Structure formats: C-alpha cells, structure tokens
Amino acid sequence: IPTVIETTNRGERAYDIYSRLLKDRIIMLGSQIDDNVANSIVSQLLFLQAQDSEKDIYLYINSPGGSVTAGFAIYDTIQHIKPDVQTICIGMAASMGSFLLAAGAKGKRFALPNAEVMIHQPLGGAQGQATEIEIAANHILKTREKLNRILSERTGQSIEKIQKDTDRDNFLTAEEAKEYGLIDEVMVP
Amino acid sequence: IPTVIETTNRGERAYDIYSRLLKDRIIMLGSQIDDNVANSIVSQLLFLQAQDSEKDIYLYINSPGGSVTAGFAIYDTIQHIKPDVQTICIGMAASMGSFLLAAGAKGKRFALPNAEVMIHQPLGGAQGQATEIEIAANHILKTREKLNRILSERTGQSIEKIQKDTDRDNFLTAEEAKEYGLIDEVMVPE
Amino acid sequence: IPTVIETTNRGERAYDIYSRLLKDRIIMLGSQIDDNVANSIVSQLLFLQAQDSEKDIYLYINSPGGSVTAGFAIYDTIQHIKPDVQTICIGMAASMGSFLLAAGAKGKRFALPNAEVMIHQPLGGAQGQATEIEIAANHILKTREKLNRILSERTGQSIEKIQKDTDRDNFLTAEEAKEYGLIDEVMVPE
Amino acid sequence: IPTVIETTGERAYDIYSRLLKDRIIMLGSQIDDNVANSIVSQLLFLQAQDSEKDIYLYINSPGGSVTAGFAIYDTIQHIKPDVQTICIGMAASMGSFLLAAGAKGKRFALPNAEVMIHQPLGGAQGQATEIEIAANHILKTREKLNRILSERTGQSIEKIQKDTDRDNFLTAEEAKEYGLIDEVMVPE
Amino acid sequence: IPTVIETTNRGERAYDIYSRLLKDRIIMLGSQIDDNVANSIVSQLLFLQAQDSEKDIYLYINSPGGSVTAGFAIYDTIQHIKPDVQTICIGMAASMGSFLLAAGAKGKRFALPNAEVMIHQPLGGAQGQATEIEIAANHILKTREKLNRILSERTGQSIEKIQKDTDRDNFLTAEEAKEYGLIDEVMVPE
Amino acid sequence: IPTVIETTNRGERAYDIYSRLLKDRIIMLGSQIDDNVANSIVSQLLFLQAQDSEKDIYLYINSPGGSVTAGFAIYDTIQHIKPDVQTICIGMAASMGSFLLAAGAKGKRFALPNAEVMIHQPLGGAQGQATEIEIAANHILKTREKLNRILSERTGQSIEKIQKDTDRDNFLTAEEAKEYGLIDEVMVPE
Amino acid sequence: PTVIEAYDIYSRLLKDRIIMLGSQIDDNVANSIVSQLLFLQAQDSEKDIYLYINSPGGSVTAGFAIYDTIQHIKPDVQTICIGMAASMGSFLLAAGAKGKRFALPNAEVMIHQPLGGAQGQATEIEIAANHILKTREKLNRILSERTGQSIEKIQKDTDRDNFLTAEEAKEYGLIDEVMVPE
Amino acid sequence: ETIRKTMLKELKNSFRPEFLNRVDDIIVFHKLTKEELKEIVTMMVNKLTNRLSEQNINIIVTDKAKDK
C-alpha cells in the first residue's frame, strides 16, 4: 500500500492511499465483511458524520460478502447518520455486499459498467441436539425473512419475488441490477 | 486501519480511527472478550474517568462473547467509575457481550434497529478425576448463579424467568430486548 | 524494499520506491491480481486523476493473472478516469494481466522486446448439486463471452477467432502480440 | 491498543504508558520470564522515579511460572515504595500469590472478582533418580509457597496445605475472610 | 539491517545500508529472482534513470537464480533505460542470475576473484492432457531458444556450443567465465 | 514493552524500559542464551565500557540456560572489559546462567532471597558414525572440563566436589548458593 | 535494545567501525556484511575495520563473497573470534589481516570439509561431486596460503570434524594472538 | 467556485478566526488562462517597444512569436 505525503505550512501529512481517499469522504469496503471490517467502517462513517454532517459520503464496494451481523451493523450506521451515503459498486458485490450496495441513498447507488452483483440466501450451520438445531434453523429463517423484508422495501420488488430469486445464486449484470432495482444507474465513462 | 488527520488551532495531529473515537469518549468493544481486550477496555475507561469525571462514556458493543472473568472485570470497572457509561449495541451482542450491554446506566442503554442480542448460560469444561470435575462443575454453576442474579437486578425480571430463558440460545431483536428489559429503547434513525 | 529520501525543496521526507514512483505517475503491477491489489490500483488511479486530470499515467504490468472481477474493476477504473493510461508489459502479462494490457489507451499500449503474453479462457470450479453446477457453468461461460467481446472490441478482431485462440494456452511474443493487436508497438531499446 | 493524547502536556502516550505514568503496573497476562522481566523493570524504574509514592499493581492473570512470580515477589518486597495490589477479574495460581504479596492494608479486589489458590504444577520424566530430584524440587517449591502464604495471610500452614490441595475458588468476600485481600472496593 | 548515519551539509541524515548504497546508485540483487524482487529491481532502475539519465548504475548479483519471466523483465528494463548498468558478480550468479550477469554493458561486467557462475537450461513442468503437455514443452523449448540466442549475442559465442555447455550444469570460475565471455574482467584486488 | 518518560527537569526524553535501564548501566539477561542474545549482551557491554570505563556494570540474570559457546562469549566479554560487572540473580539462574552468575566480580555477586540457582553438567548430542560419535563425545567432555575448571576458579571449591555435585541437577537456594560459593551474599530486603 | 546519546546498538557499533557477524552465514547476512564493508570503506578509507565472528557456518558462496570483499577493500579488517567459528566462519576468521586476527581466551573454532548433497542421475551426481571436490580444493588452497600450512596436512586435519581451542588455533596459524584480559 | 471554497477553507486552518474577522476582504487570485498569458506577453512587449522607441529603435513582434 503506497504512502502519500502532503506538504502544508504547518507540517507533513503522510497518508496511505486508503486514508487519502477517506480525506475525500471515500470509504472502501474491499474485503470479506467480518467484525473488524464492520467496526472500522462504522467508526469511519461516524467520524465522517462528525467532520461535516451535510456533505455526502462515498462507499466503494468490492467484496464477496461475509457476516450478516456485520452487514447489518454497517446498514444501521448508514441509515442512522444524517449525511447521505452514495454506494458505488466496483468489481463484485455478493451476499452482504449487494445488500449494502442497495442500502445507499436513493438516486445515488451506482455500479461500474462490467460489474457483477450476486444475491442469494444467507449461509449458516447447525450442530448438536434436535432442539439446538431447531433454534439455529429458526434464527437463520428469521434472518432471511428480515433480509428479504429490507430488500423488498429498498428495491420496490415483492417479498415473494426476492424469495424466489434468492433461492439459488443469482448473478446480475449492471443493467440487470438496474432493472432489478438494486442499483440506480450505471456510471458511463 | 484508516488514519485520520485532524487540524486544530493547537496544531495538526495524526489519529487512527479508534483513538479518534476515544478522544470523544467512545470505546469500541468489537472482538472476542479475552484478557487483553478486557485490559484495554478497563484502561480506556480509567483514562476517560481520569480526564474528567462528569461527562458520559460511550461503549459500542459488537462481540460474539468471550471469557466470563474478563466481562466481569469490565462490568466492575463500569460500575466503579463515577461517569455514566452508555452502552450502544452495534450488530450483535451475545454471551457476555449482552451481559455488558445491560451493565450500562439506566435510561442509557441503546440498540440499533436491526441489531440482535443473544443470551445463554455460560460454557465451560472439566477434565480429570471425579473430584476435579465436581470442583469445576460447582464453579460453573456458581458463575451461572452470579450472572443470573446480576441480570435479574439489571433487567427487573425474575431469577426463575432468566434461568428458563438462558437455558438455550435465546436470540432477541431490539424490540424483544427492550420488552425483556435488556435495553432501554432502540435508536430511532434521524 | 529500499527507501528513498530524495524530495524537492526541503528534501526531508523519505519515500519507498513505489511511493516515489507514484509521484511520477508510475504504477507497478508485479503480482497476482486479487482484491487487495485491485483495490490499491483503483485507489492509485483515482488519486492520480485527482492530482492532474490531463497528464498520462504509466502502468507497468508483470502478472501471471488473477481474479476476473479484480481485473474488471481495474479495467472500469482505467476506462472511467479522464487521464490516459499507458500499459507497458514487463516480463509476462498473462490471463487477466493480458486483459489489462489491452486496456490501455489506444496507441499507448507498449511491450518490451523479450516480453511474453498469454491469452486463455478463464478458470473456475463448480461443486455441489447439478443445479448449482449449471449455475456456475452459466456464469463462467458468460464471463468468458464478456471477456471475448471486450478483447474483440479493443483488438479489432473477430470474436470467433478469439474464441478459437483462447481455447488453449496461447503464448505470444511481443511481435506476435503486436501483429495480434493486444499491444501497439514494441519498445525498442535506446 | 489505542493512542492517548494528554491535553495538559500536548504529548502522546499509549494507554499502558499513560497508566504507568500514574504509577500503575498492569499484570494482565500469563506470567512468564519476559512478562516478569518487564514488570521488574517497571517496578525498578518507578522506584527510581520517586522514593515515597505508592506503586499500583493491577492483576488479571491465570498464573504461570513460579520462578517469575518469586522474582516479582522479591522485587516488590525489596523496593521501599508500598505496592498496592488490586484484583481485576481473575487472580489464579501465582497471580493469587502476588495478590497477597502487596502492602498490608493496601490489597484491594473488585466486587465480582474471583481468586484461585492451588498447589503448583510441574512434571518429571526420565530415570528414577531424576524424577526423584524433580519431585523433591516441586515439593520444596510448594513448601516455600505455603510458608510465604501463611506468613502473609496469618493462617496456619496446615490449613493452607489442606485448602490448596485442590483448586480452591474464592469470591471477593471469601478472599476477604481468608486473608488474601484486605477489603472490597465498593462503587461510589 | 543496521541503520547508517552520515552528517551532510544539510545536517545529519540516517539511512539503512541498502538505501545508503542506493544513494550511490548501487542496486543489490541478493536473493531468488521472483516477481516481487523483479518488481523492486525494475522500480529501482526506473527511479535511478529518472534521477539522472547519464550516470552509471551498478548491479551486485548474488543470486541462485529464479524465474525466467522475472529475469527477462529485469534484462529488458536494463537494456531499455538510457544510463549504462555495470554488473558485478558477488559470490554466486547461477541460472537467471548468470543471464543477468551478461546483461551488463560491455566492458563493465565484473566478477570477484574466487566467485562462481553457473549456466542452466531453464527448468519447468507440464501437467494435464497430451495437448497441454505439448503446449508447455513448446513454450519451454522456445524460451530456451531465446535464452541461447541472447547468450550468444552478448557473449559472442556459438549457439551450438551454448547448447552443449547448457545441456548439463556447468560450473565456471571467474577466470573460466572471463574466457567464456560471460564477464569482461576479474576484479583484481587493489 | 512499555515506554516511559524521564528527566522531570527536562521531560522531553522517552525511552523503552530496557533503554532506560541501560542508561544506568543495567543489562538484562532474561531469556534463553542463544547467539542473538549473546551478541546483544556483548554489544551492550562494549558500549557501556566505551561510555565510561570506570563505573560498574550491572547484569541481571533470569534464564533457564542456553548454548555453552554463547555463554562463554559473554564470559569472555565480561572478563575482558576494564569496568567491574555486578551480577544479580533475579528469579532463576540455571545451566550456563549460573555460570555467568559466578562470572561476576569478586565480592559483587548477589542473589534475591527467593532465588533458585541450578548447576548441572552440559547437555549435548551425537548422531552418526562411531568416529563422529567419539569426536563429539570428546568435545563435550572437554567443554565440561573447561566449565568445571572455571567454576572451581571462581568458587574456590575442589573440582572433584564440583564433578560430584554436577552429576545430576542440583537445585540450591540463595543461602545454599552462598554456602557453596556461587554468590557473595543474599540481598536482604530493606 | 536502543542506545541513546538515538541509535540501535548495532548501528552504534558500526559508527565505531565494528561489524558483527553473529549468525548463520547465508545470502542475506553475506549481503549485509558486504554492504557494511563497502560503506565503511567509503566513509573513511584509512582507519581499520573490526569484524566480530560468532557463527556455526553457512553457505560456501556467501563466505567466499565475504572473503573477496575483505580482500578487495583497501582498509584492513581485523577479525576477533567471539564464541565459535565453524566451517565458513573459521575460513573468514583466517581471512583477517596479518597480525590482527584475534580470539578470546576460551573461544573455540572448528575446521572441516564442506557439506553438500547430490541427487538424480549418475551424470548429475558426478557433476555435483566434481564441483564439491573443486570447492574443497579451493578452500584448502586458500587456507594453506593464509595459514602457511601444507595442503596435505590441511586435507588430513579437515577430513573429520576438528575442534581447535584458542591455543590450538594459535599453533595452527588460524589466529595471530589470543586477547589477554586487561 | 469549488476551488475558491476549498482555498478559503484551508486559509481558515492557518490563521486565527479573529484575525480573518478583521480583514475587510479576502480575495482569491485565479490561475492565469491562455488568453491572459497572451495579453501579458502583449503588454510586456508593448512596454519594451516603448522603451526601445525612446532610444529610436523600431521593433515589432509577430503573433506567432508572442504565442511561442
């Protein structure tokens, strides 16, 4: 990761390229969404809200997805803050990545021309006694229901259509995602 | 980990995002609760109390659980310091993480809309002779009794009900947690 | 990774070789194209577009290949930024590396004399049920079709011929790549 | 580990260095040779810093090497500052030893804290003579531990031998009754 | 790597030993030649040519060999940059390292007295179907043909004799290397 | 390791704890004695001698043992430098750690009250032909004899008694170390 | 540890022209030593360089590179044997300038024939064995030149492992005199 | 517009608010354009032509020369 040095009268600022982008209100989601990445992104969003609560925050997504709880934390932080969050899909947006891609401000969710978006039902695992397996299955079904509800509210599609589309791995191009309502427009060069 | 450069009349300073949040009296608890994390949290709380003893302290919780003793250390530190400690649940607060969520000041425990909390009896393990297994089992049962007692005192629910509900994994939504007494009210978006 | 203290005027700051080359709009791609490398490349491209929207960027490529999605992200960032990007093939540009080599500005794609390029169909895997295998096969076939279409557009050659040539591993010298259309001219030594 | 900015000195510390400035030494990990060396260095530096003020030892550790604990005990007893010991979380094995090794009347424990006292662990392997030597050494180490604990708690060596035969878990109130600590820090 | 400190007219500045040598345009190649080392060497060469395009560059080679692609990338970069590149053999220069040993400018290819050089035919491997093995074998033979051609041009020696001496491992002393043509003169101690 | 602030009259200097201890001529031997640790100790002793050849050097020992050659290098550096070296046994001094403990200046070797000193014959191993096993055994016996000679010189005890006592692992307390001659006096607490 | 006046301890020793060779002699260590030697030659080409040797050995090529760098530079190189010097380490100990190779009183040195390996066809094994014999011949020739000893005697003593103490190093010509304490 | 805004914001981070509050007007100088540089060359050439004409030397500079 390269280092960027900026010279002022007061002193030297040694950014790394991600921090330099963050100076311009760019947050990069470019890895699997685990607890650490979600915590870092939440802290970045909160700091960007503090610095100025009126300008727009830009979120760049290139990730295979990850934890549902981490994605929900990011979604809650995005919806809670006053400034609008523009979501731009570079490369891939899968599982939780697509959920966060759809979570941007209306009229402000973008994707690069040959970017790929994948929607599917969450993965999980149950092990042990029958009662414990039942508890785990109930939890995962509740989580899937919540995700389908949010996606229906945020994309304008019926809950049944999203249930049918998310049964298997559905791969959508930028045009298909625009037609599906996941993104708002493709960014022409 | 991103780096934040903040300009002030005193000069320009380079922060990382977590220390920048700590400047605003915000403590991030976002990993498995082991000895090192609990030590860091206790140190941060003690320093925040030292800086000044009247403003609020904010604890953001996103953890799957961890050691019971580390969580007890964190809870005791929270209860011992004069400034009020607000707890906000980000994402998931499970096992001792949910226990620390209820440890916040009354009227100041928060949770995000699509956040989840999970309460269950503690785990453990015993190996060796029958007497050793008896000792370990007595220890784990006493730990469960202490946890249940603290939860009953902080949530207002009967010890028997918390005993029944923590028998298995209990997943609660923010509204279910509020009606159960774990949190005070959910954070409405603004 | 040697450091360099050479800077103008004050000359106090020290750079590593890659950061110093970044100031000269030199971007090095000397490893497999995964998500981390692609994200770094995209950030560097955006930073260089911000620094000056008119001057050209220099992209030295030496990569066995990598993720198709990462290469697509790099390709979109290259084709989206206003400044032109020169692709210079160092050593081997194979798989997605050759795709990014053809992604440079028209008339601004170069290769060193004793350099090698390779083009082939994308690799992948499909495991599970028959339906899942069908879905994965459809996805990989569509990815190959999109890659072939982009290569045909950027090389001016029929997609039938590219499909025929990408069936197996096709190794081309710098002159053969020039005749094929992936590059524009071979950088003769001084 | 977060970085801390002190506004009264416009100078930056890490949280552990900031605590050590206030004469706070944290024992929050397994006690091995490296950790004991660091603790002894911090204690000696603090003794150099001021001949009078108290040093604070915050203990949260499952235990560890007996020799490292003996080094820490010797350093604590040698230095003429009083060393207050506060039990944060767990004080088990050699950790409970250093808990009772603090200054009399200055041994504190958090309300919901637990301590553990038990005989030291070890192992032997080889010929009969070597195993006999190892057993003699471990028995002498246990005897010295029991003697120091009986001296610093006021209870009989026989009772400590009986209670430390197995794993003895004590609450803060039970540790107060036993004699390891002096009183429990009540919250404000 | 020890830190190295000098007092200049601009004050006292410190370097690591390799950065200090790079200040005097000394480039050290002292490990296996993979894509990372090749990327670093190419970056250093480009930086040195940008700093001053007339002065000489020095390449101290102590390498057991490496990838053919990385070595060819370094060779192309050396032959492309305007400043001359002196090459000095320290210890061992084997396989691709010996190829990079001959890459230096004529009259500026040195070697330490009791140093050893060794030329190989390139290693490789093939796996899969008969067609895939055919393609891999063709690629390896063409790579060896290119290596032999470049070696013949730089050392001024017949291609057939290079084939003969390259079929098996060929250890050469500094005097034998000088007589063969890989180096120009042995560095007599002074 | 923690960082401390110093110089209450100056306040601007901060050192790591071992650098701060090295300022007062305190050298810590608190790990297994290998080549790197011995090199660091020797370099520290040389620097301390260079800074002031009159003042005394302090060596703190807490080590289970280590290589015979590295400890012998430490012994040589201790015995060659003009300034006196005081040795204090913190915790344990076993194997060659006790040898270095006895290596201190006459009348200036101290041990803590509850400190254990262990003396035993050196370990080793031989694997190979009969001649190689004989060579290795002869070397091990020679180095044991050298250790016994030095220990007898610095302890005043007959070499037969050392041979008998070092047959097995002999654990001694501080009082028994003083009676045996390893240390000069036990550091009584203040 | 950090030495304050701030420099790391090895940097501080390098300021006094003291070069420490205290690890296995591989390519990385050889490159570091060569670079340090070149810098010390450049910084002041008239004073003397001190090399401290404590190593079990390593690569023959790395040791030969270090030997060549020592011989080529104009300023002289005193070698002081701290602890052990084995295989290539003893060779570099002998590489010191005349009258200025040192060894601590109870230090130990080792001389033995280089270790190697061969695997594959008969021709490849023959090539590897020929190279190993040539390398041993070169090592023996340089040792005979630098110790004033006959080639045959060095060959005989090097056959098996040969432990030499400081006094045996003295009468063997490996070191020039033992460093008496003062 | 954005360039002026960001330069003004950066100026606030280098001077005290009460110092900038007492300034009557803070003016941002825009970068010179192509035609502005051409006019600057024209004005300097006119000044030089006057100064050489007072010495009775007549000089004219073509448009291509001025552009170069």
Contact by Cβ (8 Å): D50, D43:
no
Contact by Cβ (8 Å): C115, E76:
yes
Amino acid present at B179? E
Question: How close G168 gets to chain E, by Cα (Å)?
Answer: 28
For chain E, the distance separating the N- and C-terminal CA atoms, rounded to the nearest angstrom, is 27
Q: Does D167 touch chain B (CB under 8 A)?
A: yes
The C-alpha atoms of residue F56 and residue F45 are separated, in whole angstroms, by: 11
Give the CB-side neighbour count of residue C59, counting CA atoms within 13 A.
Answer: 31
Are C17 and E50 inside 8 Å of each other by CB?
no
Structure token digits, residue G30: 């050889």
Number of H helices, E strands in chain F: 7, 9
Burial of H59 (0-12, 13-18, 19+ CB in 10 A): exposed
The C-alpha atoms of residue F78 and residue F72 are separated, in whole angstroms, by: 10
Resolution rounded to one decimal, in angstroms: 3.0
Tell which residue, F1, F188, F169, has the closest CA to residue F98. F169
Are G14 and E2 inside 8 Å of each other by CB?
yes
**Beta-strand runs (E) in chain B:** 3-8, 11-16, 26-29, 57-63, 85-94, 109-111, 116-119, 170-173, 185-186
Which residues fall within 8 angstroms of residue A70, CB to CB, at 6 or more apart?
A: A33, A34, A35, A37, A38, A96, B62, B91
Q: Does E106 touch chain C (CB under 8 A)?
A: no
Contact by Cβ (8 Å): G103, G109:
yes
Contact by Cβ (8 Å): D76, D88:
no
- Phi/psi of residue E173, each to 5°? -80, 175
What phi-psi label fits residue G17: left (phi over 0), alpha (psi between -120 and 50 degrees) or beta? left
Structure token digits, residue H62: 């073509």
Burial of D59 (0-12, 13-18, 19+ CB in 10 A): buried
For residues A19-41, b (16+ Cβ closer than 10 Å) or e, as one string? Answer: bbbbbebbbbbbbbbebebbbbb
The C-alpha atoms of residue C8 and residue F1 are separated, in whole angstroms, by: 38
Which residues fall within 8 angstroms of residue H27, CB to CB, at 6 or more apart?
A: none
Best mutation target among E47, E49, E75, E85 (most C Cβ atoms within 10 Å) is E47
Q: Does C114 touch chain E (CB under 8 A)?
A: yes
Q: Please state at what angle helix C35-51 crosses helix C68-80, rounded to 10 degrees.
A: 10
Tell which residue, G28, G43, G99, G115, has the closest CA to residue G73. G43
The C-alpha atoms of residue D73 and residue E2 are separated, in whole angstroms, by: 38
Catalytic residue among C80, C120, C139, C152: C120
Contact by Cβ (8 Å): E168, G123:
yes
Q: For residue B168, give the nearest of A42, A73, A135 by CB distance.
A: A135
Tell which residue, A113, A108, A109, has the closest CA to residue A99. A109
Tell which residue, A126, A14, B143, F134, has the closest CA to residue D89. B143
Question: How close C155 gets to chain E, by Cα (Å)?
Answer: 24
For chain G, the distance separating the N- and C-terminal CA atoms, rounded to the nearest angstrom, is 27
Question: How close C188 gets to chain A, by Cα (Å)?
Answer: 30
Structure token digits, residue D176: 């107060």
**What is the maximal distance between C-alpha atoms in chain E?**
67
CB-based touch G/C (3+ pairs, under 8 A): no
CA distances from residue A130 to A133, A136, A138, B101 in whole angstroms, order as listed? 5, 10, 12, 30
The C-alpha atoms of residue B64 and residue B95 are separated, in whole angstroms, by: 7
- Domain annotation for chain A: domains and CATH numbers: 17-186 (3.90.226.10)
Q: Is F80 a catalytic residue?
A: no
Q: Does C21 touch chain E (CB under 8 A)?
A: yes
The C-alpha atoms of residue G164 and residue G158 are separated, in whole angstroms, by: 11
Which residues fall within 8 angstroms of residue H45, CB to CB, at 6 or more apart?
A: H61, H66
The C-alpha atoms of residue D83 and residue D103 are separated, in whole angstroms, by: 6
The C-alpha atoms of residue G89 and residue E186 are separated, in whole angstroms, by: 25
Which residues fall within 8 angstroms of residue A133, CB to CB, at 6 or more apart?
A: A126, A127
What 3-state class would DSSP assign to B113?
A: coil
Contact by Cβ (8 Å): D103, D84:
yes
Tell which residue, G142, G169, G16, G172, has the closest CA to residue G68. G142
Structure determination technique employed: cryo-EM
Q: How many CB atoms lie within 10 A of CB A131?
A: 11
Amino acid present at C44? Q
* DSSP at D121: P
Contact by Cβ (8 Å): G46, G74:
no
Q: Which residues of B touch A147 (CB under 8 A)?
A: none
- Closest residue in B to D168 (Cα) is B135
The C-alpha atoms of residue C176 and residue F125 are separated, in whole angstroms, by: 62
Amino acid present at E100? L
Which residues fall within 8 angstroms of residue F48, CB to CB, at 6 or more apart?
A: F22, F25, F27, F57, F81, F83
- Phi/psi of residue D186, each to 5°? -80, 135
The C-alpha atoms of residue E94 and residue E100 are separated, in whole angstroms, by: 9
Contact by Cβ (8 Å): B16, D3:
yes
The alpha carbon of residue E82 and the mean position of all alpha carbons in its chain are separated, in whole angstroms, by 17
Structure token digits, residue F190: 């203040």
